[PDB]
Design a binder for these strands. Structure first.
Lengths: 7, 504, 23, 505
DNA sequence: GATATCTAGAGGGAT
DNA sequence: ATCCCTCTAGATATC
């Protein structure tokens, strides 16, 4: 699940 | 979405094992590659940079000895190449030590005070530190309450994956406790290392566009109608922005003009007539007369001409430049049941639907195939355009199976068979014919956009240098895994000595 | 040679259209 | 090469007559057939050469000065003017016009007529792939009257046969049959159809001749000639062909106002500050990202698209089950070996094709069609040759080049909840599907836009009273479908739709 | 403001 | 030198 720095 | 990067520039990150790069360099590289993705993927996101551990002090909160040695280098604003230049050059390691809890206090202050007047769907705080600074835990309770109230996510980036000093081990205890108190046990998966973060950010963000909602009705005859929704699924993606021609001495697009001229030798635009070629003759055909005689159709039609066997529609005949996925109308249980019945009926009988599709009244009508596509999460019809009578090329080629000159021997066939086994791109697993792909070619970003963004970024940062060569990691993802190449070294040699190839 | 166009040699005569014919 | 065809219409003594009184005469029936060929040729192959020659008249118009043979048109590309000229003799009100400007009542020698046709062929400057002559006659008596000239006729016919002339025959109406082989069966190509019947029905192959052809009919040519590289040193040469191509309306031509001549157009770029002109080397390409303007040269813009040399590079072999039918990007191509570049490519190509079919695998390759284009990933799906009951090839043997999509080519779909249907509902829809079954063929539908466009051009070029309306075969037959289904639709709607639903709104 | 289509210009090969 | 075909840019509607 990509969130934060990766989204 | 508002993102605040909290980076440690303390003295402890300056020194490390000479055999590996300093954690300060790794954090600088990670942040730089994150900003590059945001700049070239215009998504209106806001980025703010906070540094703790430097000599200077610049915070909204000063107080006494606390909240010091921290500087808000960059406020909350859109990313730009000025930020990239500042990160590359202005940011330098410090010599002081700061509490990353105190840095977390300032990060909340920045994200809370500067978010007024704007709406953000998400809020994130990223911490880059090595947890090698002595600190006192005396306020944790109010921080955890504050984050749960403001709904702000956290991520931690450590120089080691989750031979370290007890201070780092002790410091690891608090961050483990924080992630538990914020986002449960799976919060353990939101702590990253610089190595794996570097791997995940090596490529630019893939170009993404939102398919529009296309409502219509699937008609079978005249008394049967199903409300459907269609979206574009697969298409040849293009660049978001095109090159703009500007003058070479002022770099302005308004100082040039493009015009067309007609010569027999000078003709005005109002003294020309549209015409068509009919064999060896030319007949005048007025544009206004054309639209009077153009084919006229009622647009927005999705009508089923009939159903045929799936085997009768070969894949090699697919035409068009798009693939449509047809779902039921949004918030319509009656339409969902009706479309589900058609999909399951087609799948059980192994049949497909031949439909007539027109985008609107200005679109040329099309004839395509709608075949069922059933998954465990959703089910829908897939529309691909089918050829007309005029689009078929009837070429004839000489046969190869019954050719004496080009008949391979049994030794040549054996060599080719060995090559195919060695160069296999898939492997069976679990003894249950579970084929996994060693080279998907569908999760790979388009190298055209990756190369273009690299050149644009290099030119902006260094406007007086030639374009750099293609990145090494780009070639790696464009090539099969190394074990595939190694296994084929021997079979390829056998083919070279068994098939005499001569270039005339 | 059967299966050719009397108008254009080198191409087989195309069967005329007629679209959908239910069984 | 260019196809060449010569029509040879007789008007000797009786081709203006009919055994009945309500059907077309042999003369105007032949004229209608010729006009249909011109229209078919114009649409299909405007580069071909066509001509019309009349024999048996009193006058002569030819470069040989032999009486009783008239050449109405020489070998040239078809055009609207020629069709209109032939319209002067179509049916009634033109027979007397033909019988005034020309006329029947003169003896003719068939040997001399073939000589005129041979001379017409020799006058062509271009290279002719096929040289054909079509005979339009319904009378075979005079050759039996004088065997001396009859022997000359077959002697000349043999001379034309070895030259490369493939003479044909198109008999017209004649009482008592066409009594074939009385003088014929040695002049014609006699390829087949040696029916001893006199053919009381006097239309053997005029039915398909009158069938108008409306298609581009492009000849075979290789899209590209690339090199398939198994590795850096094993290289074979293959040819790329497109078996499906979107047919487009011909581009409009800019015409002058009164003199009606084509005008050449070019695009020039000039700076508005001075009104001069700007060379292509005096401008730079620019883009805006962030708050900075990035400037690149024209050459640098092209150089950032260069990845690999043109050709196909073999990455590996993938099972056919890993290729998704819904992962379609663009029309597929056809790969066939080319022995004119690398000797021995066919042997390796056939070996790869045979084993790929046996093991059901697809060769995944990196495709660069030409210079300075980023590569794509393609799969070479093996394709076995298919033969019909007539032993005529319908699917060529080779490899099918299937474009695979990148991550950028896939769009995210909106979230929806699955709604399974009860078996009763599926059963009713199964009956509906079974009722509307039909056999699908790739050539079952025609482009309504293109077909209507061709009718409009024909009407204006031939000043017809009103254009012919093409029948749209892609329109669903609602009347037929409603009759076939019957009460099935009403039952299905009752089972699915509650009695308050409004699908129209 | 982006999304999507048809139409109208530049550009690389095949013959 | 002509024609064919992919690519790029330009003009026009609904979302």
């Amino acid at each position: 699940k990509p969130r934060g720095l990766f989204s | 979405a508002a993102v605040v990067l909290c980076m440690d520039v303390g003295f402890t990150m300056s020194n490390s094992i000479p055999g590996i790069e300093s954690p300060f360099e790794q954090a600088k590289k990670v942040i730089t590659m994150f900003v590059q993705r945001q700049v070239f993927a215009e998504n209106k996101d806001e980025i703010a940079l906070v540094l703790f551990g430097t000599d200077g002090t610049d915070n909204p909160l000063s107080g006494g000895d606390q909240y010091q040695n921290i500087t808000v280098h960059r406020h909350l604003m859109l990313p730009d190449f000025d930020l990239l230049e500042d990160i590359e050059s202005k940011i330098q390691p410090g010599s002081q030590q700061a509490d990353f809890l105190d840095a977390l206090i300032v990060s909340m202050d920045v994200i809370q005070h500067e978010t007024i007047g704007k709406k953000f769907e998400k809020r994130h705080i990223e911490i880059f530190t090595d947890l090698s600074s002595r600190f006192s835990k005396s306020q944790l309770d109010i921080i955890i309450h504050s984050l749960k109230k403001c709904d702000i996510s956290l991520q931690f980036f450590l120089p080691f994956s989750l031979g370290i000093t007890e201070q780092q081990k002790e410091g690891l205890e608090i961050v483990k406790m924080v992630m538990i108190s914020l986002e449960g046990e799976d919060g353990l998966d939101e702590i990253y290392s610089f190595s794996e973060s570097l791997r995940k950010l090596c490529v630019f963000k893939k170009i993404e566009r939102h398919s529009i909602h296309w409502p219509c009705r699937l008609t079978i005859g005249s008394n049967l109608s199903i409300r459907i929704a269609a979206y574009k699924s697969i298409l040849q993606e293009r660049v978001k922005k095109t090159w703009t021609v500007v003058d070479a001495k002022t770099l302005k697009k308004e100082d040039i003009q493009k015009e067309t001229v007609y010569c027999l030798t000078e003709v005005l635009k109002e003294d020309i007539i549209q015409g068509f070629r009919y064999g060896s003759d030319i007949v005048p055909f007025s544009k206004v007369d054309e639209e009077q005689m153009k084919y006229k159709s009622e647009g927005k039609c999705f009508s089923v001409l009939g159903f045929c066997k799936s085997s009768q529609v070969q894949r090699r005949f697919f035409m068009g430049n798009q693939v449509l996925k047809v779902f039921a109308a949004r918030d319509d249980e009656a339409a969902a049941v009706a479309l589900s019945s058609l999909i399951h009926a087609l799948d059980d009988l192994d049949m497909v639907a031949i439909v007539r599709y027109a985008y609107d009244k200005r679109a040329n009508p099309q004839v395509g195939v709608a075949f069922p596509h059933i998954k465990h999460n959703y089910e829908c019809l897939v529309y691909v355009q089918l050829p007309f009578m005029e689009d078929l090329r009837q070429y004839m080629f000489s046969s190869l199976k019954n050719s004496k000159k080009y008949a391979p021997t049994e030794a040549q066939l054996n060599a080719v068979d060995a090559l195919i086994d060695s160069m296999s791109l898939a492997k069976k697993d679990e003894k249950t014919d579970t084929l996994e792909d060693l080279f998907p070619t569908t999760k790979i970003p388009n190298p055209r956009f990756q190369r273009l963004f690299q050149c644009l970024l290099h030119r902006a940062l260094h406007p007086r240098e030639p374009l750099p060569p293609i990145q090494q990691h780009i070639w790696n993802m464009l090539n099969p895994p190394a074990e595939v190449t190694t296994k084929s070294q021997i079979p390829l040699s056998k083919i070279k000595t068994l098939f005499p190839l001569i270039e005339a | 040679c059967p299966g050719e166009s009397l108008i254009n040699p080198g191409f087989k005569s195309k069967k005329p259209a007629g679209g959908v014919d239910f069984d | 090469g260019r196809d060449s065809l010569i029509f040879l219409v007789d008007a000797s003594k009786a081709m203006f007559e009919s055994q009945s009184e309500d059907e077309l005469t042999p003369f105007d029936m032949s004229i209608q057939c010729i006009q249909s060929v011109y229209i078919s040729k114009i649409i299909s192959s405007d580069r071909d050469l066509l001509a019309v020659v009349f024999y048996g008249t009193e006058k002569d118009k030819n470069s040989v000065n032999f009486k009783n043979i008239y050449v109405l048109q020489e070998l040239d590309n078809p055009g609207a003017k020629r069709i209109l000229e032939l319209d002067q003799f179509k049916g009634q009100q033109g027979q007397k016009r033909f019988q005034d400007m020309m006329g029947h009542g003169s003896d003719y020698s068939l040997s001399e007529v073939l000589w005129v046709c041979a001379n017409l062929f020799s006058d062509v400057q271009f290279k002719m792939s096929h040289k054909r002559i079509m005979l339009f006659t319904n009378e075979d008596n005079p050759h039996g009257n004088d065997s001396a000239k009859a022997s000359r006729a077959r002697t000349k016919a043999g001379d034309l046969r070895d030259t490369g002339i493939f003479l044909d025959l198109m008999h017209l109406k004649k009482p008592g049959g066409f009594d074939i082989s009385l003088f014929y069966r040695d002049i014609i190509s006699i390829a087949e159809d040696e029916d001893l019947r006199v053919h009381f029905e006097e239309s053997s192959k005029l039915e398909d001749l009158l069938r108008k052809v409306r298609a581009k009919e492009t000849r075979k040519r290789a899209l590209s000639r690339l090199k398939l590289k198994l590795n850096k040193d094993i290289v074979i040469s293959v040819g790329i062909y497109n078996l499906v191509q979107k047919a487009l309306k011909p581009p409009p031509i800019k015409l002058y106002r009164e003199t009606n001549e084509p005008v050449k157009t070019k695009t020039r770029t000039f700076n508005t500050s001075t009104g001069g002109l700007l060379l292509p080397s005096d401008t730079k390409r620019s883009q805006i990202y962030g708050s900075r303007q990035i400037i690149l040269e024209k050459e640098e813009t092209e150089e950032l698209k260069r990845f690999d040399d043109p050709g196909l590079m073999l990455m590996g072999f993938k099972p056919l089950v890993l290729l998704k039918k819904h992962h379609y990007l663009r029309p597929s191509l056809f790969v066939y070996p080319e022995e004119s570049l690398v000797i021995g490519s066919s042997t390796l190509f056939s070996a790869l094709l045979i084993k790929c079919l046996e093991k059901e695998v697809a060769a995944l390759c990196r495709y660069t069609p030409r210079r300075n284009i980023p590569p794509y990933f393609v799969a070479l799906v093996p394709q076995e040759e298919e033969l019909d009951d007539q032993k005529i090839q319908v699917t060529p043997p080779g490899f099918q080049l299937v474009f695979l999509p990148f991550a950028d080519d896939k769009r995210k779909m909106p979230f929806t909840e699955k709604i399974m249907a009860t078996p009763e509902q599926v059963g009713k829809m199964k009956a509906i599907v079974e009722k509307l079954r039909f056999t699908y063929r790739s050539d079952s539908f025609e482009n309504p836009v293109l077909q209507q466009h061709f009718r409009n051009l024909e009407a204006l070029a031939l000043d017809l009273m009103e254009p012919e309306q093409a029948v749209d075969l892609t329109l669903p037959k609602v009347e037929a479908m409603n009759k076939r289904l019957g009460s099935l639709v009403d039952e299905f709607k009752e089972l699915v739709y509650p009695p308050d639903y409004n699908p129209e709104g």
